[PDB]
């Protein structure tokens, strides 16, 4: 139930598939990229969280969290996997291949706050509802990603490889990126989706 | 080794044993207090994490930590769990008992940032040492507190009931605390600590 797909769509990119995995750690890989969309905005993309190793850190640590136990701003469902998920990993990257590495391109982060601006992450249980959230998506938009995410969604097993003592490590780097909260608020502002009508948490 | 005690010191108030827990969650509890001791300027507090439970959730978790494995200063060596606990921990606050719950006084505890300015928190391996880092205490107040540690270190075994999963519940609490760099950054220059001289990662 709590642990079931959370789908967690942004903006990759502004003009002003794929494996998700969590602040690029290869090993913390939580699902796939379902649909993406080069929106007139930039580039859209819509992902699912399905890795049930990873929905379980997270159920277990949503229990602890004082700011996931204040719920949701008002008509909203409490949802504690969703919101300690929209509280941790609030932004978005995608990283493309380099020559440089060993061995839109790559794959995709859930990071603390992304790099590029209007990156913020919003999950949802439902990718319609995920969708439906951003102003800048024309119900055009909305045809494209959605004949997408109807051929992708919740075989290799549990792509997940990381464990309760990576994220808790990189928990205490986030703690550590300056102007976090601020670029998170130009963010949910510039993309036009407010905690009246999500569960952003910053 | 790297999971051996680790003495924390610090002002818990200014004018400007008991347990020793995580965040007040009673099931968290880590150590004890070694000594405490009026000095002029406040209530010096001068702590031992003593929970192998606890230092080893913590061990493994500063070895996926960026800011960790950036290590300290200069000349200063690298101690990955001190350098986690430093950054995550960077606060104390002394709770004391009321009427009102369920059953300097009920237990002091490990925060981001204290609630009372001057709260900074400074680990080591070392009770002198630590002691040794606080430009307001005198050669007599660190007798005091050394006549008493040498008294209290590292039953009913090991105290920590909590988790991997409880930690990483409240460091994304932590996230949403608002001005924690910055009351943390006039901690340090209040009680007159320095990155050059320890492992404030604030």
Chains 1, 2 share one sequence.
């Not at 990257?93 to 790559?106: A, G, M, T």
Request: hydrophobic share 35%; with cysteine; glycine share 8%.
């Amino acid at each position: 139930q709590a642990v079931a797909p959370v789908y967690v769509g942004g903006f990759l990119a502004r003009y002003d598939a794929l494996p998700l995995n969590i602040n690029h750690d290869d090993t913390a890989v939580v699902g796939h990229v379902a649909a993406m969309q080069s929106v007139r905005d930039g580039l859209f993309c819509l992902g699912c969280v399905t890795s049930p190793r990873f929905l379980e850190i997270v159920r277990r640590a949503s229990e602890k969290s004082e700011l996931v136990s204040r719920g949701p701003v008002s008509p909203l469902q409490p949802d504690k996997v969703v919101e300690f998920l929209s509280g941790s990993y609030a932004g978005l990257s995608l990283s493309s291949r380099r020559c440089d590495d060993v061995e839109p391109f790559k794959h995709v982060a859930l990071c603390s706050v992304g790099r590029r601006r209007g990156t913020l992450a919003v999950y949802g249980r439902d990718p319609e509802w995920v969708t439906q959230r951003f102003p800048d998506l024309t119900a055009a938009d909305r045809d494209g990603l959605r004949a997408q995410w109807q051929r992708c969604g919740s075989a290799s097993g549990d792509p997940f490889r990381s464990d309760s003592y990576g994220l808790l490590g990189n928990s205490v780097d986030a703690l550590y990126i300056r102007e976090r909260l601020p670029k998170l608020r130009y963010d949910k502002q510039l993309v036009g989706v407010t905690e009246r009508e999500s569960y952003v948490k910053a």
